[PDB]
C-alpha cells in the first residue's frame, strides 16, 4: 500500500481564507477549491508585469489564463493576481515551489481560489485597491507607498 | 521602480 | 492501534532522545506483542517500508532480525510476503521498485533471517538471465543490476559462505557486460568530454566499484548497520531458506528502465579542507548517491523536508556532505532523457539548502555553478537549457548578485560558443523574470554587448492600413475590418501583413491586450489564414512585429494553436524556414516548438481518456456504443496529426542536416561548427522528450526517414534512440 507519512503534501493544502462574496456554502467553497486549477497569487509590486508572472508560473506548467489584479476605480495593477492551469497537478505544483519564492524581489504567496469570477479582479478595499493595503502601517514602494 | 502602473482597461478548441 | 503502528515503524531511525539500537529493541518489543491479533497489519507494513523507503533499508532488515529472533514463524511470513510482493513488482514493471526488495532480501542474511544459500540461488537465476535469447538488453541490465547494487550490503557475508558459487556468477556476469551494446552512452552523458570526469556508463561502472570492493575483501566504510550491535541475539536467531526463483519470463507486455549514465563533477581535490570525498569507482560513492536519490524521492513535495532529511543524512564515517548533495541535486536536474521530477524543485531545494546551511551551503553551490561554466563546451544542450533556466532563476530570489567579472573569458571568445551563449540566454532569461533596465544596472560595462535588447514593437497599401488603424481605434466591427481590406493590391498575402502589423501594433501594450486582440478579431484571422501558405504568413509577419519580444512570439504562438488560427504542422514548417534561420540556435525557437507538440501530445491525451471514459461507462452498464466507434475515429485522426508532425520534424532535421554535412566535405571545412552542435543535439533532444510516444514510429522511421543511406552522424541519433528499450 502506501504511508500517510510519504503521502504527506503539506504545500498543497488549504489555507484558513474564504470568500465572502462566494455566493454559498463553505463546504460548497471546500468542494470546489479541492478541484481547482486557479491560484490566488499576494504581494505582488504594483510594477510586476505579466511578462514576469507568465514567465515563473510556466515553470510549474502550461498557463490557460492570468487575470491581472486591479485598482476598482483606477484600473491599474494593485498587487495580485490570479493563475490559472489546465490540470490540477500543474496548479498543486506552482503551491509547491513557487508559493513562498521571489517575483519582482518580493516573496509571493499563492493560495487555492473557487474559480474566477466577473468582479473579482477588483480590490474590495474602500479607496479601490486591496484591503490589506488600507489598514498597514509600514513603507512599501512597490505597493503604492504609505497605507490609506 | 523606474517603470509605470500598468493600466488594464478593456474557447479552446484543439 | 492500527493509526498507532503505522507512526511507530515510520518514527524508528529518525531523530531521538534515545539511540537507534534502544529504539528497535524497544519496537521489536511492541511489535511482538502486537503479533497475537495484528500480524496481518505488520506484515504488510513492513513489506510496505522494504519498497517505499530504502534509504532507511538496514534499520528495518535489523527489525525483523529482532523479530525473527523472538518468533520464528513470523520471518518465516514475512521472507514469503516479501516474494509475493517482488514477484508483484516485476508483473507490473515496477522494476525501481524490485530493486529495494531484492536488496532487502540480500541485507536480510546479514541479519540472520534468510540462509545465505538461498541468496547465491537466485543470484544465479538472476543472471541467468543474461544467456537468455531473443530478449531486450535492458531486461538483462536490470537482472545483472538488482544482483551487483546488492553486494555493498551482502557481498561479503555470500562470498564467505559460498565463494566457488559465487566466482561462476562473476564469471558470467563479467563476460556478459563485456559483450554489451553502448550504442546508448553519447546521448546520455551530460558532457561529451571525458576530463576531468569520464561521464560513465551506469552498469561499467557499479562493476569497477564492485571489483574494488571485492579487492579490498568487501569492506565497505559507509554503510550504517545496526545489527552488528544485536550480534549476541543474531547468532542464535534460526535462519529461512528463499524459495527457487524463477524470473518472470519477457512478454511484449513489459517495460524495462532504461539505460543511465553516471553524472559526476567532484573528486575530493574540490574541497581540500573537509572529509576526503570517497572515489567514483568505490562503493561508498554509489551507496551516498543512491540513498541521497532516495530521500528525494521520498520527500520532493515538502521542499522544507526534503532539506531536513538530505542535510541530517548519516553514515559510519564523516564525509563532504554539502558536496554530494549539490552534486545529486545536479545529477537528477541534467539527467537524461528527463530528470526525476519537475525541474522547478530543484531551484526550490537548493534554495531551502542555503536557508539550513547558511555558513557552507551557498559557497559549494556557488564553486559547483562556476565548475559548471567552465565545463560548458561539451555540456549537452539539453542540459544547458536547465542550466541557464535554474541559474536564472536562482538569482532572480538572490537579487541577481553574482561575480559576472569571474567570467570575463567569455567576451574573447565567437559568440556562438557555449560560454558568451550561455551569459546572452541567462540575461535574456533573467530579463524576463526582471526587467530591461534592471539587467543593464547588475551586470559590469563589459557584459552589456551580450545583454538582450529592448523588448519593443517594431511597427511598418500604406494607406490601408491607416484606415484599420482608426476602424479599431473606434470599436469596430468584423464586418467593417473585413470590408477595409477589400482595397489591397495583389502582387493575397499584403492582406495578412497590413492586419496583423496593424492589430498587434495597437494591442503592443501587454499579454492581456494583445489576447483580446485575437479573441475580438478571431473570424478575420480564421477567414485570412485558413489556407496553409495563409498560416505561414501570419506567423512569418507577427514575427517581424516582435523579434525583439521572444516572449510575446511564444505566447502568441500558443494562442494562435489554441484557437486554431494556426495548427501545429504550420509552426513546426515555421520553425525550421529561413526567417528563423539567424536565430535557430537561441532557446525561444526550442520553447516554441516544445510546446507547440506538447499541445499535440495532450489533444492526443485528452481524446484517449474520452474514449477510456466511454468505455469504462459501456463495463458498468453491462447509442452508447457508436459513441465509441466515433471516439476511435478521432483518436485515430489525432493520433495521425501527431505522426505527421514528428514526421515533418525529422525531415526538416534531417534536410537541414544534410545540407551542411554535404557542404563540409565539398568545401574541405570541419564538420564539428558551433550551429552544427545545437542542431545535432536538438534532434537528440526530440527523441528524448518524447521517447515513448516517437516509439510507435519505429516501422515508418526505419523504413522511410532514418534509413542506411543517410550520413552516419545523422544516423547515430536514431539507433542511440533505438537503444533506450532495445
Ligand atoms: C487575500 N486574498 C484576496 N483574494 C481575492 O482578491 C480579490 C480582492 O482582494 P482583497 O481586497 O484582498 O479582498 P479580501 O479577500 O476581502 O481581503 P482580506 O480577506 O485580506 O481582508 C478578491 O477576489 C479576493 O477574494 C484572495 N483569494 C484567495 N483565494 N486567497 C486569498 O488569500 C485572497
Known sequence: GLLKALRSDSYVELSQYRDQHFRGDNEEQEKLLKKSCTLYVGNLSFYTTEEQIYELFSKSGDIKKIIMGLDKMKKTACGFCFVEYYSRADAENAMRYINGTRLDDRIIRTDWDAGFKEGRQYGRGRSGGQVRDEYRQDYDAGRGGYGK | ?14 | TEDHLESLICKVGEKSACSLESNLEGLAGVLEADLPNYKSKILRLLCTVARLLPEKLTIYTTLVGLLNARNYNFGGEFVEAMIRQLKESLKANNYNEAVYLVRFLSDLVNCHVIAAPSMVAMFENFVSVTQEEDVPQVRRDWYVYAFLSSLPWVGKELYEKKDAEMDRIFANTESYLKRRQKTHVPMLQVWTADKPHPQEEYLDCLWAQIQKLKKDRWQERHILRPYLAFDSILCEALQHNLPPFTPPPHTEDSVYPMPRVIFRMFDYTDDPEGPVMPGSHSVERFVIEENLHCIIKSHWKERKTCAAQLVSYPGKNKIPLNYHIVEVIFAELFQLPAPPHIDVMYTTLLIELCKLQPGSLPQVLAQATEMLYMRLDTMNTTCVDRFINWFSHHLSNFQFRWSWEDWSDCLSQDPESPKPKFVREVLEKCMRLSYHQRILDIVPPTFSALCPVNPTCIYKGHSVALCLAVAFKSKATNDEIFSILKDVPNPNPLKIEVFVQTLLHLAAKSFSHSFSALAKFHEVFKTLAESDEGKLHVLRVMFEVWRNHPQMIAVLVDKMIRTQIVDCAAVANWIFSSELSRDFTRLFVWEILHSTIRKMNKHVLKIQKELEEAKEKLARQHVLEEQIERLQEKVESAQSEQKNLFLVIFQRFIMILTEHLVRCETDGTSVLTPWYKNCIERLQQIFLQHHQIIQQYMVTLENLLFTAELDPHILAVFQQFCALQA
Open chain 2, 1 to 14: 521602480d523606474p517603470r509605470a502602473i500598468v493600466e488594464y482597461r478593456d474557447v479552446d478548441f484543439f
